[PDB]
Write a protein that binds this ligand. Sequence first.
Ligand SMILES: *[C@@H]1O[C@H](CO)[C@@H](O[C@@H]2O[C@H](CO)[C@@H](O)[C@H](O)[C@H]2NC(C)=O)[C@H](O)[C@H]1NC(C)=O
Lengths: 109, 121, 307
Amino acid sequence: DIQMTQTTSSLSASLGDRVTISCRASQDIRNYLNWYQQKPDGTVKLLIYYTSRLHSGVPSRFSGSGSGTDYSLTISNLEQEDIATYFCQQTNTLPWTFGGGTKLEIKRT
Amino acid sequence: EVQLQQSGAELVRPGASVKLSCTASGFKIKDDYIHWVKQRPEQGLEWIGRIDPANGHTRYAPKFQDKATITADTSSNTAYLQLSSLTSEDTAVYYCTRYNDYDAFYFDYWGQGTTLTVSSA
Amino acid sequence: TGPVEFSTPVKDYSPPPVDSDHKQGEPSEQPEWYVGAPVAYIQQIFVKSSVSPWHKNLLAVDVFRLPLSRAFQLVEEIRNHALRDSSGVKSLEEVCLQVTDLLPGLRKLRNLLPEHGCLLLSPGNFWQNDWERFHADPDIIGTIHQHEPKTLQTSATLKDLLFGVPGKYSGVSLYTRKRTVSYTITLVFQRYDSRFLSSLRSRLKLLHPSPNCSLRAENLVHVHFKEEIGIDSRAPEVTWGPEDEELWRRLSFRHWPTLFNYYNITLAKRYISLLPVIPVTLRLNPQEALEGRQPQDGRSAWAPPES
Ligand SMILES: *[C@@H]1O[C@H](CO)[C@@H](O[C@@H]2O[C@H](CO)[C@@H](O)[C@H](O)[C@H]2NC(C)=O)[C@H](O)[C@H]1NC(C)=O
């Protein structure tokens, strides 16, 4: 199977600043990486599919890029409603696998 | 518009069987596959399997061959996931989802999730 | 007193029963010939390209070389496409219409039309889908127009068959208007599979996204064939409009019968179904042509007929 790894499990950030989330695949997946947003309420939402395509209704703040085994998800300016856990899924080999998820946090002190 | 309404929480003794349900609104399940995704607090998200309601053809991850059983019913517009031989490892939040693009294979709409608890108590 | 075309929505399609009804209902809108399964379902991938920073150093050979170079990769991708989460069919080999040999007497067209495999027509059939042959060819226009007749004929020409496109959209005259040759990869299906067709369309869309495209693609079209008895450069952009779908209506009226007669397949008493077109858009670069520049550059052994 293909294992997806999100190295930075927790990532500190702040409002207005840009945030990048990167996950690496065990092998080449041919740009078949979808990104999912899981709010603390528990609802799961789709942000980016294929490798850079925005789902209908997703704000333009979200963007994605990458190739081969390394891909990333970026937010132009972090908003308060953007605080959630982000998962990356590979859809290359039939047993779909998800990443570990990265939780965004607000900078303190 | 398109929604997927799942059942309520469950609390079942280990060794029994459970039948989760997923009711689809805004579309007919004859059109798209229905998927079930398992989430645990410290184990990420796991893909269980899917069903083609128009055909009844199901397939599962190798981990869930002897654990899950997915069934769909077109008339009631509802899909079901059955877990057998419950164990403490099986407690999780199970999500119901579909896809409509058949090359990117992205889960475009998700249910709210049902919390399942296994305990002798 | 009789219709020739019949259109049905794609949403829920199934071929009519062969003999479940002895006599069709009197007010039924379905024509009397719409009874059995079609001979074949025809899927067309319309490939339109453009050269954005067009400049004076480009030549008429480039207008053909740049798009047809991608044709080999596109054909290979279509042939090797597989539905990764399929419940029924997986690849094109389980659904395409197989052909064994051409009619004896058409040996002149051997190695130009497909044989012993799927009926897949593309401009790469001129060079047998070999990009090495395409690159080593010193006269692309000459190879394309090798078998072009000098006078109008009833039967469709080999260029028309392999391009799947009306004459005006191709040809050397496009260089004067700075446009680019557009062709079509024609797939002939014996069976219908909505999941596989949707997967193919979505895969092609992901690979070659088409900007400002709003094609409907809502209905099939069924065509019935009767019996015959006689006893500041500003290069134009890639626009998709209402005349790109239903483009088969502008082909020669003997196109499909000519294509199907070569393989000993008759459309005299039957009908065919024409699936909605799948758009594909390519963006090209003049530096590619300038680097792929070849000797024997601006001298082809072909001139337009009748000047
Ligand atoms: C071309 O196709 C026609 C049918 O469209 C074939 O005609 C019949 O084919 C069967 C095949 O077993 C023969 O038994 C009949 O004797 C044929 N009848 C007639 C009137 O042709 C025809 O044989 C095919 N020819 C080739 C060369 O494939």
